[model samples]
Target: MLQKKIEEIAAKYKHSVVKKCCYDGACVNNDETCEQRAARISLGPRCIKAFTECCVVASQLRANISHKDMQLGR
Candidate 1:
């Protein structure tokens, strides 16, 4: 169940990354200019936010699942 949940989250994250890359001009040539810099600056927060949320969700899920298993054995 945990693996399934993690896979689902990973799929969603893959989609998010694609969308982010498209909107951030990551798909573009870059031209070694400020465009890439601007894109990075704009999208950096979004990536960071997603990572933070995922970490929190993962921590909570692991704790809950462990607790549930302990209860089951009791």
Candidate 2:
């Protein structure tokens, strides 16, 4: 639901204003400058890499783990 909101707004605005507030470095946690609260937002580019990850977190999966790995660890 929240992810949809971020994608929805990004779909229309190309860049979410709310998302901007996140990386602007003008707002703090205790007292949000923009007064908006949303962690499921991406204030960066149009998520151009969302569909195809350039590196790190390939897709929706969070961890930076590899995708072709079959074993847990050594």
Candidate 3:
């Protein structure tokens, strides 16, 4: 269930700024580290905002699932 949701989000953003940053060179910035570059790219623009939302939501969903397991004494 969680996997599916995350996958769906992945598919949705596959053609968004995510792809643009990689292929179209929409907002390319090479003066930073890979992590820094990714972070900055995700900060603005309509599609770019959605890109980060998908990332953050998926991360939180995964975290919640793991947190549930921890509470169950896993």
The local distance difference test score of each candidate is 0.39, 0.28, 0.39
**Count of clashing residue pairs in every prediction:** 0, 0, 0
Candidate 3, run of 10 with poorest lDDT: 23-32
Error of 2 at 50 (Å): 18
Q: Which rank order by lDDT, best down to worst?
A: 3, 1, 2
Write the residue-wise lDDT of candidate 1 on 1-74 in tens digits: 42343344545665567344333222122233222444453555544444334434444454455554322210
Compared with the true structure, the alpha-carbon lDDT of candidate 1 equals: 0.39
Q: Per-prediction TM-score, please?
A: 0.36, 0.21, 0.36
> Considering only N, C-alpha and C atoms within 3 Å, which residue pairs clash in candidate 1?
none
Could you tell me which residue pairs clash in candidate 2? none
Choose 1 or 2, whichever is better by lDDT: 1
